Amino acid sequence: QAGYDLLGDGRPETLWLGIGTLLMLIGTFYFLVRGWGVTDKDAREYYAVTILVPGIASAAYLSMFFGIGLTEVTVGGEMLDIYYARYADWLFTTPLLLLDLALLAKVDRVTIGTLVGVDALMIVTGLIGALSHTAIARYSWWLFSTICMIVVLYFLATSLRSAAKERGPEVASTFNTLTALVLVLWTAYPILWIIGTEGAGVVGLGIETLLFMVLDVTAKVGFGFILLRSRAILGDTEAPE
Ligand SMILES: *C\C=C(C)/C=C/C=C(C)/C=C/C1=C(C)CCCC1(C)C
Ligand SMILES: CCCCCCCCCCCCCCCC
Ligand SMILES: CCCCCCCCCCCCCCCC
Ligand SMILES: CCCCCCCCCCCCCCCC
Ligand SMILES: CCCCCCCCCCCCCCCC
Ligand SMILES: CCCCCCCCCCCCCCCC
Ligand SMILES: CCCCCCCCC
Ligand SMILES: CCCCCCCCC
Ligand SMILES: CCCCCCCCC
Ligand SMILES: [Ca+2]
Ligand SMILES: [Cl-]
Ligand SMILES: [Cl-]
Ligand SMILES: [Cl-]
Ligand code: NA
């Protein structure tokens, strides 16, 4: 794999995992310190949700860097590396990012349940695909997971967008800018997976780990930076509970 075997354990992708860990930690601490000076009850909710996004990713990246949760999946003559913490991270952080968007939109708890349930199914079926032992199974689960992603993104772009519009320009503009980021960046994930080690195998583990690290940092720290600097986070919220 393209990279550098930092820990001397035969894993050049640790260069990227290590850089990812550092960036996630810096982002977590930045949001934490910025949050300490926030008093508005709504803004504090966005900070709490958002700090946890690079925070949990920090833990996952540190895990992966040290090789905790790494195994091999047999696919014919090949043995493909799977990091469980990648999927566990996404399982927690994608619902948190969706909750940020749902708070902005001020949508009801059944809408939120639908959005996060389909998102959880997306991640679970991606994991099943990653653990599957035939190409046909891996591609099939990938397709199912991708359909789930399209459903999530469609809900964001329609139902939540229309709800956010009613909340006036500040909220609408922030919702729209973050949704623009999400529709593009999230779609990059299935593309990378299917061209990479889990799918067609064009892109190797090194380049793939690098690019997932860039996507992760952008979709977590980048997203959070954009959200938390906005006046929209001062607007009234209604948590699902
Ligand atoms: C770290 C934060 C984010 C935004 C992660 C997003 C992850 C996905 C959108 C993953 C999607 C997948 C699909 C649609 C198909 C199977 C392969 C994936 C699990 C990578
Ligand atoms: C104004 C001070 C900024 C401090 C932010 C620290 C976070 C560093 C992590 C890098 C995140 C890059 C996101 C990419 C955006 C497209
Ligand atoms: C209170 C109004 C919101 C109603 C939302 C529920 C709609 C049902 C959609 C179910 C989506 C599951 C599809 C699974 C992914 C292929
Ligand atoms: C010789 C291979 C054995 C038979 C396997 C065929 C499975 C094909 C199913 C494809 C599932 C697509 C998921 C998308 C949701 C409709
Ligand atoms: C209103 C449309 C909602 C559904 C959109 C789902 C797919 C998003 C399309 C964006 C494609 C980005 C490609 C980037 C290639 C690097
Ligand atoms: C001998 C070891 C060579 C190390 C070369 C590292 C290349 C540059 C590191 C930056 C990686 C991209 C960061 C993306 C930020 C989100
Ligand atoms: C032999 C040690 C290589 C360290 C790579 C660091 C690259 C800068 C981010
Ligand atoms: C309050 C800082 C972020 C906490 C992240 C939780 C996961 C770490 C194990
Ligand atoms: C919750 C953080 C996971 C990383 C553990 C580090 C163990 C080093 C051997
Ligand atoms: Ca307020
Ligand atoms: Cl405040
Ligand atoms: Cl207040
Ligand atoms: Cl590679
Ligand atoms: Na290493």
UniProtKB/Swiss-Prot annotation:
Modified residues (N6-(retinylidene)lysine): K220
Keywords attached to this entry: Cell membrane, Chromophore, Hydrogen ion transport, Ion transport, Membrane, Photoreceptor protein, Pyrrolidone carboxylic acid, Receptor, Retinal protein, Sensory transduction, Transmembrane, Transmembrane helix, Transport
Membrane-spanning ranges: 13-34, 44-65, 84-105, 109-131, 136-164, 168-196, 205-237
Positions in the Cytoplasmic compartment: 35-43, 106-108, 165-167
Pyrrolidone carboxylic acid modification, residue list: Q1
Major localization listed first in the record, in broad terms: membrane
Protein's gene: aop3
Family: Belongs to the archaeal/bacterial/fungal opsin family.
PANTHER family listed in its UniProt record: BACTERIORHODOPSIN _OPSIN, NOPA (EUROFUNG), PTHR28286
Protein name: Archaerhodopsin-3
Membrane topology label: Multi-pass membrane protein
Extracellular topological domain: 1-12, 66-83, 132-135, 197-204
